[PDB]
Structures are given as C-alpha cells and as structure tokens.
C-alpha cells in the first residue's frame, strides 16, 4: 500500500511550518471531526487576566542570558540554553518566559515557546493507535516541539463531557482547576499518542499573561529523537486508571506499564 | 549645520515585522522613553472582551477568500481588499479569523498580518516627533494600527493628558477609547495634518466584540519617501486643543492655524 499524502497542512498555514497528513496504513480520511486552532480558545467566559501592569517582568538590557534576569529567576527548576533548548533539575518545573512588559527585545533568549513550532512534524496513520504524530527530522534533546492547544474549560465542565480522549488536566495547585479539552477545538498535539517510554514531556509555561488559572502546556523532547520516530508522552496513571476499563496500552515497549498484562501484574503485586 | 543622528535602531524592540528606527536632526531630544512600546493593545483593568470562539461570524471558503461567497467579505461595510492587500472604499472591516475554514494567508488578513511598510520616527521642526515614510506607499496600503491601552470613557475623562487618546466613537452602547499615553505603538507619534494622507478604519479580527473595534491606518493617496504621515485628528480635538496651540501642518488649506482661527473669529 502506497503512503498517500492527504493534506498539505492540517494547520492551514497558522503554524511557522506546515504539518502535512499522510496515511499508508488504511482508508481513513483526513480527520475533520474537530476544528484546528493554533492557540487556545474558550466557548464560555474565561476572560484571561491580561493586566499589563500586573505582569512580573525583567529590566535586562542584554539578551536575558544572565542569571540576573527576573523572568529566569521566576522559572522553577528549569532554564534555556543558548540554542533555545530546555534544561531541567526536577515539584514540577515551571517556565516564565519574557513578555510585553519586559524591557528586553522580542528575540531575547527567554522566548522559545512563544516563538512557536520550528521542527517538521507529520500527522500519520499508525498501525494500531489511530492517528499519531511523528518527526520528519532529527530533534535534539530539550527542543521545543509543540504546544498542547485546545478549549479552556473548568474541571467541573470537564467532568460532564462525554469524551475525555483529548482532555488535559492543568492540575492547578493554588486556585480552581482548569483543563484543556482538545476534542472539538485543538491543534496537532491532540493526535500525540501515549508512550510508556516517552520521548517528549509536558511543561507548564507563562508567556503573554500570568493568569495562574491557565498555564500553557509546552512539549519538549526528553531525548534525541530520530527522523520518522513517533512522538509520545506519558499520559499518566490517572488517564489509564480510567481508560483501562475500555482499552489497554499498545505502545509495545518492553517497559509498558499499562498493557492488560502489566495491569494484571500490578494488581497481583498489590 | 546640525546633522541627523540615529538614536534608536528599533523603537519596537523587534516586536513588529520590520524595525522602526528613530532619528533626530533637529535638536537634542533623546529617544522618547516616557511610554512603553507595545505592538498590540493592552488592558490595565479588564474590559471583558468577548473572546468566545462560538460567537465569531466566519466563512466557509477554501480558496483565497477572493470570491463574493466569503461571508467575512459580505459582513464588511462599504469596503474591501484587492489582490495586493490594498483597501478600496464609515467603513467597517471584518477580516477572517480562527473560526473560518480558510488558510491564514487568505486575501482577508491584511491588518492582522501587521506592518509591511518601512516607517521612521523622526524629529520634526515644529510638531515634536512625527512619523514619515521610508518608501513609496501606494494608495490603500495598510500602514499601522493605532495601539494603546483600552479604557472606558469615564477613565478617559479623568486622565490628565489626552494628547494620545483615540475615541472609537461607538454610536451605540458602551463607549471606549484607546489611550496611547502610557502604553502605545508607533501610531502615538503620528501628527495631525489638515491635508492628511492616511485614514483610520475600524477593523475586527480575532474577536467581534463590537465595543472594541481595532483602528487600522490605510494610505488615502500615493505617499512618497520622506513624506510625513498624518491623519485628520478631527474638529473635536481641535475645538479643545486650539486654545493651547495652533496647527503647524503648513497646508495652504490649514483649518486650525492661528491664521485660520483669526478668520473664523472675525466672521463671527
Ligand atoms: C489525552 C490527554 C492525556 C492524558 C492526561 N494527562 C494530563 O492531563 C497531565 N497533566 C499534567 C501532566 C499530565 C501528563 C504532567 O505531566 C504534569 C503537569 C503539571 C503538566 C500536569 C489526563 O490525565 N487527562 C485527564 C483525564 C483524561 C481521561 C481520563 C482520565 C483523566
Ligand atoms: C491623539 C488622537 C487624535 C485625535 C482623536 N481622533 C479620534 O479619536 C477619531 N476617532 C474616530 C476618527 C478619529 C479621527 C475617525 O476618523 C473615524 C473613526 C470611526 C475611526 C472614529 C480624538 O478625537 N481623541 C479624543 C480627544 C483627545 C483630545 C482632546 C479632545 C478629544
Ligand atoms: N498507548 C496507546 N495505546 C492504545 N491506544 C492509544 C495509546 N495512546 C493513545 N491511544 C488512543 O488515542 C487516544 C488519545 C488521543 N489523544 C490520541 C490521538 C488518537 N490516536 C486519534 O487517532 O485521534 C486514546 O484515547 C486511545 O484511543
Ligand atoms: N498639526 C499639528 N500642529 C501642532 N501640533 C501638533 C500637530 N499634530 C500633532 N501635534 C502635537 O502632537 C500631539 C499629538 C501626538 N499624538 C503626536 C506626537 C507628538 N508630536 C509627540 O512628539 O509626541 C499634539 O497634542 C500636539 O502637541
Ligand atoms: Zn531578562
Ligand atoms: Zn527577555
Ligand atoms: Zn523578561
Ligand atoms: Zn505501554
Ligand atoms: Zn472567506
Ligand atoms: Zn473568513
Ligand atoms: Zn479567509
Ligand atoms: Zn493644519
């Protein structure tokens, strides 16, 4: 079966680079049961706090490469290197990028996520997991890949929705909990599958607002990724504790934690 | 002779598509820094702008939105863009948005795609800072947006300095202003001309909250390199300001000079 290219760009030119779709596995048409959006949306009143006078910001007159940068200091247990790659210490990390209140320029060293997708990605048909996303180039460890984009909703709203297959929990620790639901509105991330041996990780980020209800979710590679490799993150135990009643993990890794067999082994262990 | 100094390579600090340099060949005034340059409108208290994506009117085009079937074009009042992104023509523009089925590069995206022409902030002889063209700008070309702090009418009324205040002129409902005094972009430096070469146009892009049109300047004629950009601030501005200073635009048909004022008072 020939690998058919069935959409030149599922993002319709909204990203820095196109994200084509191919299918060399079956007859499934390009997915159209969602609306592609490149930035988060709301379908009820969220009213993100964007008061420019309440943004924490820096006064740097350089490129914000120094440890004196306030925005760098606000970042929790992570920092960027000269090439825009993310380094960690590992309480989950938290990135404060520079913003419109900072004295610095738009091209300072603390602007990776807000500058958008730089790597070549592809939406493709997997053998066993439906649609997936893979790299069309080599990607070094620590590289920004893409943002988890979708519809901002309350945890209360998320609990009553019928389909939770595209639901991301922001897990706010101070204040009410919100989610990003990519079921009806989402970007390329909605198609990223779960891997027990993941090669990307989600990281909370603040950029042009610092409304603590709504960290934005950035994926960075957690290791060097090879051309053609499927992208995947660890959805987490909570997802599988719920979903395993319907289906189990097919990531196929020797380290798979969520297969029928793995779950049975964890049960007998407990 | 005093010669011209380049005193800032880019007053926008890289936030626009192109740099906007500042020069001074007139006096010793330094680069203006009594404001914060912002490339898009800000809030300092919330305006509760309706950003609900399901409230957007949007089109179903999969071409370049050049056809008469584009709902967004059908929404747009007494104006439309040509294939070069130039405005033909009080107009009200609805650009395509994130709910439309079209691509980000369709023909109805001119203002949201930002500054394309080369502008310079420069020191004028008599009118403080001004903005001039560094290139030929054909009639109908998008120049820049009037950017600043969104505030209520009531807030506008208590503010000391109204020299950078733009009235959105909502005919119905709640009244708002853009104050570029504390936060603004290159538009805050555009002077008044009695023979203007740009016009402000109301535009909707990523939201359609009708209380908050965004203000886009388009050239109203072919503009040549070196020409100072200016719009007609309007009579309301001058009815207030003329007591403090008169118009220095130098037009043969200046409406607000000391000379023009002397005639008006004489007639009455
Ligand atoms: C399809 C989406 C992936 C599954 C998903 N995972 C996450 O939401 C999630 N949230 C966080 C992480 C992760 C993986 C982190 O690593 C750290 C954090 C601070 C960024 C917070 C999930 O649990 N959704 C809620 C849910 C959906 C369906 C059934 C049950 C529960
Ligand atoms: C520095 C700003 C220029 C002066 C200014 N002009 C305008 O606000 C204005 N508003 C509109 C237009 C104009 C010129 C239009 O053409 C049509 C429109 C639909 C775009 C509405 C103004 O009146 N500000 C309020 C004000 C300030 C100081 C004293 C008195 C009043
Ligand atoms: N490791 C996995 N094993 C089995 N199914 C998976 C796995 N990861 C993702 N899925 C499937 O994909 C859904 C999650 C989606 N966000 C991913 C995109 C999805 N594959 C699609 O075609 O739309 C899950 O609810 C499963 O149906
Ligand atoms: N035609 C004009 N004649 C005299 N002064 C003007 C004229 N146009 C603008 N100004 C001056 O500029 C102010 C409006 C500003 N938005 C323009 C930028 C201003 N020239 C500056 O240096 O900051 C007015 O309040 C006047 O002080
Ligand atoms: Zn800094
Ligand atoms: Zn910075
Ligand atoms: Zn900063
Ligand atoms: Zn697995
Ligand atoms: Zn259209
Ligand atoms: Zn449209
Ligand atoms: Zn369009
Ligand atoms: Zn005049």
UniProtKB/Swiss-Prot annotation, chain A:
Zn(2+) 1 binds at residues 58, 60, 64, 69. Zn(2+) 3 binds at residues 64, 98, 104, 108. It is found in: Nucleus; Chromosome. Residues 155-174, 235-238 are annotated as: Interaction with histone H3. Residues 119-236 form the SET domain. Disulfide bonds: none annotated. The record marks 148 as: Histone H3K9me binding. Transmembrane segments: none annotated. S-adenosyl-L-methionine binds at residues 129-131, 166, 193-194, 250. Expressed in all tissues examined, with high levels in fetal liver, thymus, lymph node, spleen and peripheral blood leukocytes and lower level in bone marrow. Zn(2+) 4 binds at residues 196, 249, 251, 256. Residues 245-261 form the Post-SET domain. It comes from the Eukaryota. Zn(2+) 2 binds at residues 58, 71, 98, 102. The SET domain mediates interaction with WIZ. The ANK repeats bind H3K9me1 and H3K9me2. Heterodimer; heterodimerizes with EHMT1/GLP. Interacts with GFI1B and WIZ. Part of the E2F6.com-1 complex in G0 phase composed of E2F6, MGA, MAX, TFDP1, CBX3, BAT8, EHMT1, RING1, RNF2, MBLR, L3MBTL2 and YAF2. Part of a complex composed of TRIM28, HDAC1, HDAC2 and EHMT2. Interacts with UHRF1. Interacts with CDYL. Interacts with REST only in the presence of CDYL. Part of a complex containing at least CDYL, REST, WIZ, SETB1, EHMT1 and EHMT2. Interacts with PRDM9 and CDYL; interaction only takes place when PRDM9 is bound to hotspot DNA. Interacts with SMYD5. This is Histone-lysine N-methyltransferase EHMT2. It comes from Homo sapiens. The chain holds residues 917 to 1189 of 1210 of the full protein.
């Amino acid at each position: 079966r020939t690998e058919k290219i069935i959409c030149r760009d599922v993002a319709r030119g909204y990203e820095n680079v196109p994200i084509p779709c191919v299918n060399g596995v079956d007859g499934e048409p390009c997915p159209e049961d969602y609306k592609y959006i490149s930035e988060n949306c709301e379908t009820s009143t969220m009213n993100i706090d964007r008061n420019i006078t309440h943004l924490q910001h820096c006064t740097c007159v350089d490129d914000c490469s120094s440890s004196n940068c306030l925005c760098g200091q606000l970042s929790i247990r992570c920092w960027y290197d000269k090439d825009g790659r993310l380094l960690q210490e590992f309480e989950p990390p938290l990135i404060f990028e520079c913003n419109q209140a900072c004295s610095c320029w738009r091209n300072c060293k603390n602007r990776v996520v807000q500058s958008g997708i730089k790597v070549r990605l592809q939406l493709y048909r997997t053998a066993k997991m439906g649609w997936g996303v893979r790299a069309l180039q080599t990607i070094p460890q620590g590289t920004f890949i893409c943002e988890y984009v979708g519809e901002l909703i309350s945890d209360a709203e998320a609990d009553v929705r019928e389909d939770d297959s595209y639901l991301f929990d922001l897990d706010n620790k101070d204040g009410e909990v919100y989610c990003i639901d990519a079921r009806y509105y989402g970007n390329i991330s909605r198609f990223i599958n779960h891997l027990c041996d993941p090669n990307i990780i989600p990281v909370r980020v603040f950029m042009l607002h610092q409304d603590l209800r709504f960290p934005r979710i950035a994926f960075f590679s957690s290791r060097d990724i090879r051309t053609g490799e499927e992208l995947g993150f660890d959805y987490g135990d909570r997802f599988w504790d719920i979903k395993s009643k319907y289906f189990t993990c097919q990531c196929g890794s020797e380290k798979c934690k969520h297969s029928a067999e793995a779950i049975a082994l964890e049960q007998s262990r407990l």
